[PDB]
């Protein structure tokens, strides 16, 4: 998960790199690539939050037991 968060913010600039390259209209492929990148970033953030919550709950239950 440590590498995923780094690459995702590196890739959102990488995905845009070709977007401003043509800028340097918009292609639908690049737009949908950006959309899926941002939605997967949100999804992995949610997954990491759920994993943290589950690990925490395991922490209290093992400490109690």
């Amino acid at each position: 998960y440590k590498n995923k968060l780094t690459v995702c913010f590196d890739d959102i600039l990488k995905v845009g790199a070709e977007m401003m390259m043509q800028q340097q209209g918009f292609s639908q492929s690049q737009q949908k690539l950006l959309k899926e990148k941002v939605k997967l970033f949100h999804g992995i953030l949610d997954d990491l939050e759920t994993s943290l919550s589950q690990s925490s709950s395991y922490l209290e239950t093992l400490t109690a037991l």
Binding site: E36, K39, H42, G43, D46, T50, Q54
Partner: protein
């Protein structure tokens, strides 16, 4: 001035909240305690609106939602976004049935000990991206599988007019092959459901709560 702005807010709500469950429980100079859902408790305020009045109007109308109310998960997004209060009321009235349906879904799992050893491996929790969509994912750590159901607000052209309908569908990642161990239930849902265009299901909010239970009937 406080009373005049409160009366204006009440009139606007009556114009925008024409429903049989709309009622005001407690009236306070600094907060509003009114009920618009089907909660049975008399003194439980479904929605709390704090009154911050200025020399001419209310500075900000912060929407607060009770923990018992299933709508409390959208509280931070309402707090951090300065959207129109009328638009917030419209969204609340448009999504109240969805909130009730998801309340039933979460209370199904949240029931106390029923003297049954049916320790289901699937847990239901709400995923949130923004105010435009609400996502439900089913966590199964025992089977290591995921069941994602995304509900977005997508506009569709209807008779020369654009309307917003709930887009309940499986995500594009859910290109699940026949080889998945958990694939049977997704395939059953697809066969028995997939306005259906094969992937998406756009529905009228007045009819989302029965059809979602029809989806949830397979789930339960």
């Amino acid at each position: 001035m406080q009373l005049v702005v409160l009366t204006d807010v009440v009139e606007r709500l009556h114009k925008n909240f024409e429903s049989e469950n709309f009622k005001i429980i407690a009236l306070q100079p600094n907060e509003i305690s009114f009920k618009y859902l089907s909660n049975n408790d008399e003194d439980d305020k479904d929605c709390t609106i704090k009154i911050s009045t200025n020399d001419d109007s209310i500075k900000n109308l912060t929407v607060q939602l009770s923990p018992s109310n299933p709508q409390h998960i959208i509280q931070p997004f309402l707090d951090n976004s300065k959207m129109d209060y009328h638009f917030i009321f419209s969204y609340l009235q448009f999504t109240s049935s969805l909130f009730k349906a998801l309340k039933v879904i979460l209370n199904e799992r949240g029931g106390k000990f029923h003297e049954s050893g049916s320790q289901y491996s699937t847990m239901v929790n709400i995923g949130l991206h923004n105010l435009n969509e609400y996502q439900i994912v089913y966590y199964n750590p025992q089977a290591g599988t995921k069941i994602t159901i995304c509900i977005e607000l997508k506009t569709v052209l209807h008779n020369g007019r654009d309307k917003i309908q709930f887009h309940i569908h499986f995500a594009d990642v859910a290109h699940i092959t026949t080889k998945s161990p958990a694939y049977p239930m997704m395939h059953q849902v697809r066969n028995q459901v997939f306005i259906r265009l094969g992937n998406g299901v756009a529905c009228d909010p007045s009819e989302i709560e029965p059809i979602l239970m029809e989806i949830h009937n397979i789930l339960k």
